[PDB]
């Protein structure tokens, strides 16, 4: 109800610098930044830099005043290219006869964007920490080698726009895919 | 830096939308709630509908209770060179003449422009220019004086020295 600041107190040093200060709860000020607006006539400008110092928090600032009269005082409050997180890919698993992995991605209307794919297959009796981590520069299918003819194995994939002019975080992993023999 | 702008980190698919998520502390929510603001241009801003969430995978904070959300905003254009509770307040009409707190007097060695050492200040001895009957000899007495404005001239006195 009353998270507002109180005790808006100001004083003039008697030279060319007014200085004001106010208290505010430490909980509300943690969510919202505030600044001291001043009007030398009834322009509006703000002071900087403001100081700060248990349940309450006192903020103070020194405003230069070269002169004036009645003052109006008040307290008031991302690049796309480098922040990209593509959606996870749709992953399937096929075997001709040899096993060949296949996945699809949301169509980027700027087709020329190179897609960096990181994949990994796992032996069910092992950790992803120590798993084959193969990389690929743009594709939508990868051929796997031969393996143990009776063991169960998992598979996972993630995409990144690891370009040059671009940047961002990887995509969330796909729903893990499994197979055996 | 406040926690919402510190916890907020927007990413995108660069084709259809932007998915932002942030958080507000539970201690503040009891006081006042906050909303995410998205500006369209210099003159006109625009609000955005948001909702709660269970996790928080993009940012972090050493707080006890947090309220993570998930805001989704759509877009039909993306290029490299793109970059993006209820009324509170208080006012005061402060004339500089009546709100004047002069400086502390510096180095009785004291446009423009007293008590004993052992004795307490609870009822010390009172005191125009900057310069036995007051003290018994062989007894220390601390120097405590400041610069206050003349009543026949407004505001408050200086700091103690």
């Amino acid at each position, epitope marked *: 109800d009353e998270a507002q600041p109180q005790n808006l107190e100001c004083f003039f040093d008697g030279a060319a610098v007014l200085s004001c200060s106010w208290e505010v709860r430490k909980e509300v000020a943690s969510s919202v930044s505030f600044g001291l607006f001043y009007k030398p006539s009834p322009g509006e400008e703000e002071c900087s830099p403001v100081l700060r110092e248990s349940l309450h928090t006192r903020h103070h600032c020194q405003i230069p005043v070269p002169d004036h009269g009645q003052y109006i005082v008040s307290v008031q409050p991302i690049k796309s290219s480098v922040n990209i997180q593509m959606a996870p890919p749709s992953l399937q698993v096929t075997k001709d006869g040899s096993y060949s992995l296949r996945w699809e991605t949301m169509k980027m209307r*700027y087709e*020329h964007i190179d897609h960096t794919f990181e994949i990994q297959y796992r032996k069910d009796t092992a950790t992803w920490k120590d798993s084959k981590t193969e990389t690929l520069q743009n594709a939508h299918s990868m051929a796997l080698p031969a393996l143990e003819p009776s063991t169960r194995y998992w598979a996972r994939v993630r995409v990144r726009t690891s370009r*040059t*002019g671009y940047n961002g975080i990887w995509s969330e992993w796909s729903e893990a895919r499994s197979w055996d023999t | 830096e406040t926690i919402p702008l510190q916890t907020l980190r927007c990413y995108n698919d660069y084709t259809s939308h932007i998915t932002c998520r942030w958080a507000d502390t539970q201690d503040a929510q009891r006081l006042v709630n906050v909303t995410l603001i998205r500006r*369209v*241009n210099e003159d006109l801003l625009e609000p955005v509908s948001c909702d709660l969430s269970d996790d928080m995978p993009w940012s972090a904070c050493p707080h006890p209770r947090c309220v993570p959300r998930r805001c989704v905003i759509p*877009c*039909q*254009s993306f*290029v*490299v*060179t793109d970059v993006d509770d209820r009324p509170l307040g208080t006012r005061l009409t402060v004339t500089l003449t009546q709100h004047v707190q002069p400086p502390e007097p510096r180095d009785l060695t004291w446009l423009s422009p007293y008590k004993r050492l052992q004795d307490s200040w609870e009822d010390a001895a009172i005191l125009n220019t900057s310069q036995p009957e007051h003290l018994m000899p062989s007894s220390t007495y601390v120097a405590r004086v400041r610069t206050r404005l003349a009543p026949g001239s407004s505001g408050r006195p200086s700091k103690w020295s």
Partner: antibody
Amino acid sequence: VQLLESGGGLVQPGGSLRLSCAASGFTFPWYRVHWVRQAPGKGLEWVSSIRSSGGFPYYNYKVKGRFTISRDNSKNTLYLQMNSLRAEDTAVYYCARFYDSFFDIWGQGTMVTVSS
Amino acid sequence: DIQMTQSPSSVSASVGDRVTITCRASQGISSWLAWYQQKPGKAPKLLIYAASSLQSGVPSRFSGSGSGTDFTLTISSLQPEDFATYYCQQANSFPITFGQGTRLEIKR
């Protein structure tokens, strides 16, 4: 697959003049288009670029307090309008698509020879 | 507000020769710029995009390169229909600007 433009001609200083462009037979859902300027027998000078919902207008030097971009995603029609005009702008105007970090779709343009 | 300047200011050279041009920017670019060709009267054509990739409908004799601000455009071999004025394309940030406009000739 080639966009075209129209409007603009000889006019005395100060007077206004509308510029009307038009896309044509692309898959356009939905890219941005800029205006650029070619001074007679001289270099190339950029001018403006709106965006989608008429959100962000961008100008340059003189153009500020003169020209005004406008969006028209409706029937695919980027238009331009300038009021005060002088022989700093006595040039021809090219319409150009802005395929991400570069242009690709270009127009023939129109001459705007300001003079009385 | 972003100073884009290309050099040399003019370059004549015979046919079947190696050629070079360079863009210099005032601030950083990372890799956001492009390369345009302009025959007179006709509209400018996109020569090379992303500062290091050729557009469709353009031969491979052209070559782009560079990052940060020291960018280039080299031609490994020249033909007589390569007579035109060449321009730089900002892209890193607004306000978007171009090079001074280089013009080449042919040692006939």
